[PDB]
């Protein structure tokens, strides 16, 4: 509440856009409310787009910036999850995020990079290549690194909207290991 | 390998059909391989259909049965997850599963009921009503109850195919709690 207004731009994918949530339930809205509750005179613009890849973010970063009433004081950069989820090459997410950060650096807008994590079913080579993007870029650009901020959703499954669980091949094997003894016993009796 | 052949019918949804898996990677195929490895002369027919509700299962249970070369010795019944995931009424999943089990009882085919669990984001009233279906029906029909056989997928996230995580409203709040201190600190410096 006290002081001049601080403009924060939340630039991201569904985790900022608020997929199947009301606008005032989305991360940018709730973050703003918590900042102001702590006494900061902060306005957070929601520029999340569900489905955005790093490539889609790069295609629109300049237009989003030039559309605001003034240059934002701070950008929250949160992209890459959709790259990883669609199996796009980790090096291409790195390339696009690097260039997004270049355009922000060229305008002297400071950035907080929201780190993302590869889904653990994917290859270890992919996982290393993807996960290292965010600390690597944060160092190169002297951005703050916000770590894996959907970590509480991994701890607490009741915080995530319901969806289908589809096992991998190895997940089916664990399902069999879990049930084969009981099925074997039933078959033994008839 | 030794003895006369035992015919098991796997009647279910994507968790039996093997969504985005090869047929020989699906639960019915791998269960068969593990049973035979333990010395049982068992053939498991995959009658999983991805997307099947309890209602869809009921509409096709008689045709699946009458299509086999003889009457199956054992049915694995695994439905309800899609009901719960689509927000269909728990009482309607109970009604359809009851009737499926009636048709099997009327043919004297013994059944193992695969219990399902409501996603923890859903209401506690829904969760109670849905989760109680499977032990309740198993008692009424003297079916074996296989408990929550995708339990290992909840333990080990690397066993499940990757997909989007969409927070609830309360999940967004946990995300804010996770990040507000660091964002507050960054804003305090500029
Ligand atoms: Ca509402
Ligand atoms: Ca300003
Ligand atoms: Ca500038
Ligand atoms: Ca293959
Ligand atoms: Ca037989
Ligand atoms: Ca019969």
Author numbering:
A (entry chain A), B (entry chain A): 16 to 205
Lines quoted from the article behind this entry:
Here, we reported the enzymatic characterizations and crystal structures of marine bacterial esterases CrmE10 and AlinE4. The results showed that both CrmE10 and AlinE4 belong to the SGNH-hydrolase superfamily and the bacterial lipolytic enzyme GDSL family. The SGNH-hydrolase family, a superfamily that includes the bacterial lipolytic enzyme GDSL family, consists of enzymes possessing four strictly conserved residues, Ser, Gly, Asn, and His, in four conserved blocks, I, II, III, and V, respectively. Among these four residues, Ser and His serve as catalytic residues, and Ser, Gly, and Asn serve as oxyanion hole residues.
According to sequence alignment, the catalytic triad of CrmE10 consisted of Ser29, Asp178, and His181, and it was composed of Ser13, Asp162, and His165 in AlnE4. Mutants CrmE10-S29A, CrmE10-D178A, and CrmE10-H181A had no enzymatic activities, which confirmed that these residues were crucial for the activity. However, the function of the Asp residue was barely investigated. The loop between 310-helix η3 and helix α9, on which the catalytic Asp residue was located, showed significant conformational change between the WT and mutant CrmE10 and had a higher B-factor. The higher B-factor of the loop implied flexibility in its structure and function. Hence, this Asp might participate in destabilizing the conformation of the loop in the resting state and in changing it to a more stable conformation when the substrate bound the enzyme. In addition, one key residue (Asp162 in AlinE4/Asp178 in CrmE10) was found to be able to stabilize the conformation of both esterases and the metal ion Cd2+ reduced enzymatic activity by blocking proton transfer and substrate binding.
